[PDB]
Design a protein around this nucleic acid. Sequence first.
DNA 1: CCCGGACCTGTGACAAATTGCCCTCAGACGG
DNA 2: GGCCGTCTGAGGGCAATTTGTCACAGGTCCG
Length: 210
Amino acid sequence: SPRIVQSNDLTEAAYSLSRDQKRMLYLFVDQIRKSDGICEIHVAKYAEIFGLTSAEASKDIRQALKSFAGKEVVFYYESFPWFIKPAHSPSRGLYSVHINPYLIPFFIGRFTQFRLSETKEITNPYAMRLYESLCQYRKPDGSGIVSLKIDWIIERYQLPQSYQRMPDFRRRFLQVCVNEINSRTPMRLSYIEKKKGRQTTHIVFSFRDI
DNA sequence: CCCGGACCTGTGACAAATTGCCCTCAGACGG
DNA sequence: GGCCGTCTGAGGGCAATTTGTCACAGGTCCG
Ligand SMILES: [Mg+2]
């Protein structure tokens, strides 16, 4: 299956995208990298890749695309829009998009890589952002270990504001995203909390390949 | 000693959003 | 050449689950 690669600057960038938007973004990076910023999406190709019907494919592309308007990306700082022109359909079942050409160098560079079959069953987008940022540290054999700061997790993944109360962070983000990875990817993941006084400051992740 | 306060934890409720499903019907194409 | 049967896909919806928000009980330590 397609091998996604991206500059580490994109893995650690600040942004908020849905699963459907993140799914399309993978194809943009694949399309762009296999070479002005103009990409294309076929409804029927998307459906076969992700095992959806054409109708629900159509719905996913359409709503994701109009929800891109006004979205911005921040590299740590400098902020950019993903799109500089609205999407449009020349043909039935075909969409044409204009990626901000200034993003190209950030896409292609100190890099991250994973096969598309690893993420296509993940549902929660925050969990996608976590699996991406663990791969950045993975070893050939498939293992690694990394400590991420909690304040940095929140800024980079742009978690909603009520998850700054740690028990909600635990219950609605951390446990759920570890559970999906262990149930939906080939990776086996564990963690432990680092504290300073009463505050929990970092999260320490360990992983191997099955 | 024991107090209210400033911290921390987990859970129970509800609201707002998302999931994969269903139904209709016209376009593009080929037989 | 030109009509129609079929595969697409562009729309309109649903109930069942997940995600996002906050009230309230119960732990600690300090002065
Ligand atoms: Mg969908």
